Paper text:
The HIV-1 Env is a trimer of gp120-gp41 heterodimers that are heavily shielded from the host immune systems by N-linked glycosylation and further protected from neutralization by conformational masking and considerable sequence variability. A glycosylated region near the base of the third variable loop (V3) of HIV-1 Env forms a supersite of vulnerability that is targeted by antibodies originating from diverse germline genes in multiple HIV-1 infected individuals. Here, we determine structures of antibodies in complex with HIV-1 Envelope for all observed members and ancestral states of the broadly neutralizing HIV-1 V3-glycan targeting DH270 antibody clonal B cell lineage. Here we used cryo-EM to visualize the interactions of a complete inferred DH270 clonal tree with the co-evolving virus Env.
Author numbering:
A (entry chain A): 32 to 132, 136 to 143, 149 to 150, 153 to 185, 185a, 185b, 186 to 309, 312 to 323, ...
B (entry chain B), D (entry chain F): 521 to 547, 569 to 664
C (entry chain L): 10 to 132
E (entry chain K): 157 to 209
F (entry chain E): 139 to 143, 149 to 150, 153 to 185, 185a, 185b, 186 to 195
The structure:
């Protein structure tokens, strides 16, 4: 039969492409004058009325590690953080020959604070007065190599300047959604056995992504999503030990952090019309801020992770050890809650082994045996380098607690040779892309090409 | 559905095409890149409409033409296209000969327009 | 006049419609919101043109269709519409049944296009 | 060529017009003025398309109309236009009477549309 | 110097209240009520479409 | 540096604010003659200023 070319418009054909998505949030009320850094200032309200329509006859390949969506999210977060630090105060005259003394606080196992007095510029800019404040030890450095136990300095003023965080903004990780622009589409893989790559047998077209929690963490994942059926392990390549291996849990683990200390918020007129907030005094006794998790549930979760890992490592035992050294910002679980930045030593968590024998903890009605991690609270933050890293987090009056859910783990293996069946897993951190890489692994952005050509038996009517 | 026809046969997918070309505005401005998505979407839509219009196809998604179909492009039977094959597979298989078809359509439309202008006028 | 036909009858107002759809550019840029007016106006114009085109009406403001008029929508005589009623009053009275008419027009246009493609081809 | 027809006769230049109206996007954003070029180009294209469409000419570059040609506009023979004269010279010579022709075309298109609506309906 | 900082006004700018006009963008219109007995609300019996204020 | 036909440079010492913003130290640098101007009309061959 004779065939003729016919052009069809509005054809569901798509190809992989790169584009800038839009951030969106729910209908959050303005409430007080305080507003979130990344809500109601750079995004648009959304509507969940459109649903994810499942395509039952498509086989679309998905990739996790080669995806620019997470890079675009990181760039947007960096831009928002840079924008938020502009209108806040620039400080300046704080780092001077601080005179720090032992003060009323005495020896103890707590990290303690140093009471430092210094000269501050009053409302008159050609006059000075004396003020004092309590500072954390990591934020205090000796001024000079010479022996002097009374003169000290801030950790800053050798690097770029520092901007105090505004007290009228909050660091609450509210969920956000990513929506593609016009002419683009978002495909979500509904399969629960997705290992990171390979084809997806259950794809759905969705208008926007689900709630994405921008929680800041290095070793663990807090307030993340939960797996559908079982713990799932993701990795770019298991052979390469330099890579970072993600473990997405099925059941969350409750974690409760707290700062029993009752700090007092001070106000110092540093410059004209701009105030500086510090810790004035501690009321009551001095205690250790700490995090608590349940030992039995954590051990069961580690055993589940071990049996899941044993699939890829049949003849090798699993061992959990501490981090491979490094600075405080690397070897410690660093996070922020309530406005305070905690760095918790997780050396007591990853202590165990699994050679293939399953152990069950039964009975134990009095299951209050919990594991506690000591934490150190920091005010000077250099979370993102090269974009105005230094930030001073103002203190908050009263004692605080933060209850959250651990939903994922980040690990890294170590090398070996000569039939070494004692490979160990250690906590991993560093790069911030991996934290959000485990949340947008299901979504792929595609560009629609509606113009098509097909043969059919027809001709122009003349 | 925005992509409800995807995965079906070409004959089944050649229905309710209007839902595939009803994209609207979205988002609130934050920087220049937010507006860049709007303007590039508008430019792409205008490009597609202009390309479809220069072939003599304006206001109609389905547009039968008079250009003969060369057998060397696909060399497959009619039962191998409109009965089991999907639009995505067909596009992946036929993308190698889009430029020749576009040029032939442009030449045919220009020739038909000139012939119409000559025949209508000389009467 | 840009709105010279406003206030007159529907029959009198159905004349010189071209002046109602000849909006052009205006203003000089000060910030992003000034350009947002231009791009949103362009998007609205493209939306209106696309909606009018998917019903089989391209390049013509007046476009008679084949969809039957249900009596339940207005249930008023012809002398009550084109003789004394204005366009604003008619729009306020008929805005409650726009979606049904749009869906019927889309379905009718698709059906007519498919029937034309089937009848022209099989000869 | 984008301007390959320039310099030739009007008859020779009335061919392959499609290459004259296939402008696409270009450039990367630096400031607001870079985007202003894109949006003003889009606005100009939409203005031209709307002006061409209100005369009853949609989707076709060449469009013969029914308005009589007044002899006072050019008062030159047919051999003085399509045989030796170029498009630029003709535009420079005929730019003084564009508004009258545009108004006549608009009036003629409206009158033809109204007459078609009256004659088709009353049968 | 007890409140936010102060910026001196430039000597090369003037605070003359020159008249200004407000024009609607494309697709919008401005309606002006020509009635001289307008009390703030209620219908207007003399309306006019204007390009700018 | 001693006398010569070259344009030469001037070695100027001055007090600079150290990492402590309420403390000063002594530093020195070489500057070109066009970039150096006498501070005041009074006769002083040791005190100078930048052209800015
Ligand atoms: C921290 O040090 C400052 C001085 O460096 C202390 O302030 C003085 O405290 C004494 C004892 O109450 C008073 O008599 C002085 O009048 C205070 N001076 C000023 C300028 O306030 C401060 O009490 C110390 N804080 C703690 C907790 O010991
Ligand atoms: C400050 O500490 C007190 C107790 O040290 C907190 O009060 C407890 O809060 C927890 C919240 O999970 C409750 O379960 C307890 O019942 C409360 N009482 C006791 C005696 O523990 C108080 O919430 C802390 N401050 C803030 C702001 O949370």
């Amino acid at each position: 039969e004779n065939l003729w070319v016919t052009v069809y418009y509005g054809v569901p054909v798509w190809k992989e492409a790169k584009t800038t998505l839009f951030c969106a949030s729910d209908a959050r009320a303005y409430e007080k004058e305080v507003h979130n850094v990344w809500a109601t200032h750079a995004c648009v309200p959304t509507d969940p009325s459109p649903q994810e329509l499942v395509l039952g006859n498509v086989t679309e390949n998905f990739n996790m590690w080669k995806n620019d969506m997470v890079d675009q999210m990181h760039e947007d977060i960096i831009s928002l953080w840079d924008q938020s630090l502009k209108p806040c105060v620039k400080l300046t005259p704080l780092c001077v020959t601080l005179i720090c003394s032992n003060a009323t606080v005495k020896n103890g196992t707590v990290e303690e604070m140093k009471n430092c007095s210094f000269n501050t510029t009053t409302e008159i800019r050609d006059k000075e007065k004396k003020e004092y404040a309590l500072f954390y030890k990591p934020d205090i450095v000796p001024l000079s190599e010479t022996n002097n136990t009374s003169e000290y300095r801030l950790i800053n003023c050798n690097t770029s300047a520092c901007t105090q965080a505004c007290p009228k903004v909050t660091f609450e990780p509210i969920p956000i959604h990513y929506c593609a622009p016009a002419g683009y589409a978002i495909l979500k893989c509904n399969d629960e056995t997705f290992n990171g790559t390979g084809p997806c047998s259950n794809v759905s077209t969705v208008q926007c992504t689900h709630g994405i929690r921008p929680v800041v963490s290095t070793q663990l994942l807090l307030n993340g999503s939960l797996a559908e059926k079982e713990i799932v392990i993701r990795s770019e390549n298991l052979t390469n030990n330099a890579k970072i291996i993600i473990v997405h849990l099925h059941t969350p683990v409750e974690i409760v952090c707290t700062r029993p200390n009752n700090n007092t918020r001070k106000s110092v007129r540093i410059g004209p019309g701009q105030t500086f907030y510090a810790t004035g005094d501690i009321i009551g006794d001095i205690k250790q801020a700490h995090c608590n998790i349940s030992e039995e549930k954590w051990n069961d979760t580690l055993q589940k992770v071990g049996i899941e890992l044993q699939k890829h490592f049949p003849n090798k035992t699993i061992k959990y050890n501490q981090s491979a050294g490094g600075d405080m910002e690397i070897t410690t679980h660093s996070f922020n809650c309530g406005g305070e930045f905690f760095y918790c030593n997780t050396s007591n968590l990853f202590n165990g082994t699994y050679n293939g024998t399953y152990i069950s903890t039964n009975s134990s009605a009095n299951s209050t045996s919990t594991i506690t991690l000591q934490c150190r609270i920091k005010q000077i933050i250099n979370m993102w380098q090269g974009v105005g890293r230094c930030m001073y987090a103002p203190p908050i009056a009263g004692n605080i607690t933060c209850r959250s859910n651990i939903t994922g783990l980040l690990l890294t293996r170590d090398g070996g040779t000569n039939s070494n069946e004692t490979e160990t897993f250690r906590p991993a951190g560093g790069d911030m892309r991996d934290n959000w890489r485990s949340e947008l692994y299901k979504y792929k952005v595609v560009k629609i090409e509606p113009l098509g050509v097909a043969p059919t038996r027809c001709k122009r009517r003349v | 559905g925005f992509l409800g026809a995807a995965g079906s046969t070409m004959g089944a997918a050649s229905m309710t095409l209007t839902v595939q070309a009803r994209n609207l505005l979205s988002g609130t401005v934050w920087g220049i890149k937010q507006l860049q998505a709007r303007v590039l979407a508008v430019e792409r839509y205008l490009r597609d409409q202009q390309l479809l219009g220069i072939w003599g196809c304006s206001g109609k998604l389905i547009c039968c033409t008079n250009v003969p179909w060369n057998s060397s492009w696909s060399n497959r039977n009619l039962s191998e296209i409109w009965d089991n094959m999907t639009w995505l597979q067909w596009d992946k298989e036929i993308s190698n000969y889009t430029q020749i078809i576009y040029g032939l359509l442009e030449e045919s439309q220009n020739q038909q327009e000139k012939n119409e202008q000559d025949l209508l006028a000389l009467d």
